[PDB]
Amino acid sequence: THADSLNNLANIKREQGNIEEAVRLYRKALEVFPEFAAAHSNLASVLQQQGKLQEALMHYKEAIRISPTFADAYSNMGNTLKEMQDVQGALQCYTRAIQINPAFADAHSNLASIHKDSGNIPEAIASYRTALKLKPDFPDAYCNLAHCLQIVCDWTDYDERMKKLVSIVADQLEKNRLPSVHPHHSMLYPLSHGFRKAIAERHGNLCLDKINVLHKPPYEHPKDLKLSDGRLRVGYVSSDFGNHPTSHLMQSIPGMHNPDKFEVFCYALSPDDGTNFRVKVMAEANHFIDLSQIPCNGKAADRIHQDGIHILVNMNGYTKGARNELFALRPAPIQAMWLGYPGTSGALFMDYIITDQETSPAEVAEQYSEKLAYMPHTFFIGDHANMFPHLKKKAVIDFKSIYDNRIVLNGIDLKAFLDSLPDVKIVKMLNMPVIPMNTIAEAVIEMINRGQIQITINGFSISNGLATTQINNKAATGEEVPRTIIVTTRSQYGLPEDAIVYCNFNQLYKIDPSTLQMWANILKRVPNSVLWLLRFPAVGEPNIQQYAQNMGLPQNRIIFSPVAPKEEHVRRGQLADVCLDTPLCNGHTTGMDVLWAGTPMVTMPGETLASRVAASQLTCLGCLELIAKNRQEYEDIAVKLGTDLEYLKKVRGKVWKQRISSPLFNTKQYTMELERLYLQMWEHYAAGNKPDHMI
Amino acid sequence: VTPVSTA
Ligand SMILES: CC(=O)N[C@@H]1[C@@H](O)[C@H](O)[C@@H](CO)S[C@@H]1OP(=O)(O)OP(=O)(O)OC[C@H]1O[C@@H](n2ccc(=O)[nH]c2=O)[C@H](O)[C@@H]1O
Numbered sequence A: 001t002h003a004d005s006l007n008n009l010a011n012i013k014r015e016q017g018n019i020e021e022a023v024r025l026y027r028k029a030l031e032v033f034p035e036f037a038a039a040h041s042n043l044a045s046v047l048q049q050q051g052k053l054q055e056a057l058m059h060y061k062e063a064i065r066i067s068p069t070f071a072d073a074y075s076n077m078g079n080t081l082k083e084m085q086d087v088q089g090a091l092q093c094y095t096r097a098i099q100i101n102p103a104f105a106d107a108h109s110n111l112a113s114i115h116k117d118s119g120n121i122p123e124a125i126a127s128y129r130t131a132l133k134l135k136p137d138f139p140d141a142y143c144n145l146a147h148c149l150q151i152v153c154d155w156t157d158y159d160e161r162m163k164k165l166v167s168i169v170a171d172q173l174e175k176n177r178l179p180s181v182h183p184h185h186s187m188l189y190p191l192s193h194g195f196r197k198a199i200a201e202r203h204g205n206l207c208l209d210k211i212n213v214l215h216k217p218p219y220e221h222p223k224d225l226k227l228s229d230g231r232l233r234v235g236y237v238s239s240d241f242g243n244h245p246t247s248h249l250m251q252s253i254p255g256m257h258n259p260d261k262f263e264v265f266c267y268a269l270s271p272d273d274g275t276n277f278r279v280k281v282m283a284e285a286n287h288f289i290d291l292s293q294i295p296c297n298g299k300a301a302d303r304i305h306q307d308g309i310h311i312l313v314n315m316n317g318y319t320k321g322a323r324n325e326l327f328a329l330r331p332a333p334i335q336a337m338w339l340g341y342p343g344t345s346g347a348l349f350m351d352y353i354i355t356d357q358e359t360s361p362a363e364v365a366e367q368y369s370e371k372l373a374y375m376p377h378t379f380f381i382g383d384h385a386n387m388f389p390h391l392k393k394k395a396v397i398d399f400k401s402i403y404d405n406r407i408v409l410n411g412i413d414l415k416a417f418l419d420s421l422p423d424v425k426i427v428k429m430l431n432m433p434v435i436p437m438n439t440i441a442e443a444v445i446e447m448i449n450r451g452q453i454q455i456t457i458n459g460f461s462i463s464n465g466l467a468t469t470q471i472n473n474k475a476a477t478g479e480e481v482p483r484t485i486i487v488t489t490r491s492q493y494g495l496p497e498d499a500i501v502y503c504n505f506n507q508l509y510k511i512d513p514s515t516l517q518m519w520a521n522i523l524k525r526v527p528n529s530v531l532w533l534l535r536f537p538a539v540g541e542p543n544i545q546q547y548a549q550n551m552g553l554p555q556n557r558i559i560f561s562p563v564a565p566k567e568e569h570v571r572r573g574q575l576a577d578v579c580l581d582t583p584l585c586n587g588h589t590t591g592m593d594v595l596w597a598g599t600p601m602v603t604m605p606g607e608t609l610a611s612r613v614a615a616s617q618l619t620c621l622g623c624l625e626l627i628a629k630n631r632q633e634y635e636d637i638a639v640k641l642g643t644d645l646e647y648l649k650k651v652r653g654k655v656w657k658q659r660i661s662s663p664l665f666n667t668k669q670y671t672m673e674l675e676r677l678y679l680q681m682w683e684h685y686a687a688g689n690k691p692d693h694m695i
Numbered sequence B: 001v002t003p004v005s006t007a
Helices: A002-015 A019-032 A037-049 A053-066 A071-083 A087-100 A105-118 A121-134 A139-151 A158-174 A183-188 A193-212 A245-250 A276-284 A297-307 A362-367 A414-419 A439-449 A465-471 A513-525 A538-550 A566-575 A589-596 A613-621 A631-643 A645-661 A667-686
Strands: A232-238 A262-268 A287-290 A311-314 A334-337 A352-355 A371-374 A395-398 A407-410 A425-428 A431-436 A454-457 A460-464 A485-489 A501-503 A530-535 A558-562 A578-580
Touching: A002 A019, A002 A037, A019 A037, A019 A193, A037 A053, A037 A071, A053 A071, A071 A087, A071 A105, A087 A105, A105 A121, A105 A139, A121 A139, A139 A158, A139 A183, A158 A193, A183 A193, A193 A297, A193 A362, A232 A297, A232 A667, A245 A276, A245 A589, A262 A276, A262 A297, A287 A297, A311 A667, A334 A667, A352 A667, A362 A371, A371 A667, A395 A439, A407 A439, A407 A566, A414 A460, A431 A439, A439 A454, A439 A460, A439 A485, A460 A465, A465 A485, A465 A566, A485 A566, A501 A513, A513 A530, A513 A538, A513 A578, A513 A631, A530 A538, A538 A558, A566 A589, A578 A631, A589 A613, A589 A645, A613 A645, A631 A645
Parallel strands: A232 A262, A232 A311, A262 A287, A311 A334, A334 A352, A352 A371, A395 A431, A460 A485, A501 A530, A501 A578, A530 A558
Antiparallel strands: A395 A407, A407 A485, A425 A431, A454 A460
């Protein structure tokens, strides 16, 4: 009972976030009573929370040696092994805990989550249901289940699920517990803004709690640029310097920074994945530091501080791989959110969020903990001009008597190939070459029809767009620019030659009932037309098809293709007529992708950062006619583009040209504007002031 | 595999 009171106290000091004190109390409990299984297990769990994974494991095992049937110890040990990347060990522990006690809800829940992580959503759903059957009041499992259902577009009892999620959050916030809705998912659910911000705030808080065990004094911050030779030292922190959307967006930025005024440090939180993305940022940043080698957040934060950073840039927010503990320690005087996280941190330790007028209107400053820092056009950027320059121009094959998106060719050497051909006509839009239906045109269509990998014409390499990984797998990933001419066709994807193709290439989770109802209305108004979606994941397809069948759409109206390699995904968007953006959460990376192909995108900005990104893209692009202020307008715009064909041609021509002539894909201009904004942020603070809106 | 933004 002496030992128990120590243990019970420790448990509460832990509930509180007083980790150091909890650890001490458990140790004292074990000094008093060494064979205390519960204290070993609890101590193990808090060591795990602090990253001491081997030590934890040792205590979990002592706990199990003391009590062989301690299912809880196995379950938590399983989580430790999962944190160590030992999936097999984790499964062994979870399944052992369930064997010991099949009514143990938490174990079922932990098992479900490793199913989810491994790509087995149906089994994850099943285990979360078992968990909730065993323990109907289980917020973590209910909300995790809700996300799985979202991913596969299972909208059974949707509206009740939604308000169930809201009440769960309200209750948890009431009681100052950690909300079971992850901040990153909070945009998908009809929560209030105060709730979205609060959720983020409470998750930020976990980082503050973890760093207090270190007891660091505040860091002292440069007040001028004298020791940096008049250069603003900017630190980009990311787990995504590698093959990840982030790098696909901003890999050129570090090397475009003006070294006369800036000194760029990239802090990677991930190890080198061997990809050209990582190679490029390592090569072009003035300094590159691999913090994945320095897992103690104390020592890593010191490094940032000695480097002398003025502006530290948080590119993760609440995404996989984050180490926001680093920002909690405030190792730099100005700390800003940029690009990677489409929401607020809700945290005190972040000063600004880099955004824009269209994405984050001044009116909604309430929704963010950070001050608004406006880029002048969009805060979004993409590396498409560098990654996919072979898509800057295109030619077509005139299969009948003229379409821009049925049979398409792209290539760095396309001009030379076309010049080798007898009868090429040039359609002014600047222009689109047209290969007439001759023997050449026939050989190409025959390679495609026969699913052959490539052929040669007049000494030029002509590649089947479906076979890029077999020809050059670095060109498929976007790590290299293709060195052959590539052919892309509607027939390759079973798309109709003679109808409008509306597309959306986002993960299926971004779709909701209202959204699919809009799409179905649009398709009913445009007979012939199809909606082109991805198996992202495949098990979402029959759900989408069923809800569409119930809205009165025959099945052939929605066509699914597999997820493609990066370059093919971007290239194949040239086959669509129009992209219908997801209002609940827009295409972000995905939006830049579709626009680079010349494909107009219809969107309806909403009430969250994530639902307004596409509209910002389109604004910067200069295509305000594609932004809807409501559902009727979205449908009307979309029906207009699918029926008024001269208007379609006009609007496509405008996107096709403005992707070059506008700022949207202009990384040099973006970097220079980003540099102005950085100096504004710097003056305002050097002049002794503190964070305030910048517009 | 196709990397994506995740929580
Ligand atoms: C909601 C959210 O987090 N959004 C984030 C943004 O707010 C951040 O700015 C970005 C931060 O780095 S990433 C992110 O942008 P999103 O549009 O959501 O795309 P997501 O994260 O699902 O990735 C799909 C990928 O599959 C690729 N993709 C897609 C289809 C295909 O067939 N092949 C393929 O390679 C695509 O090229 C993509 O690379």
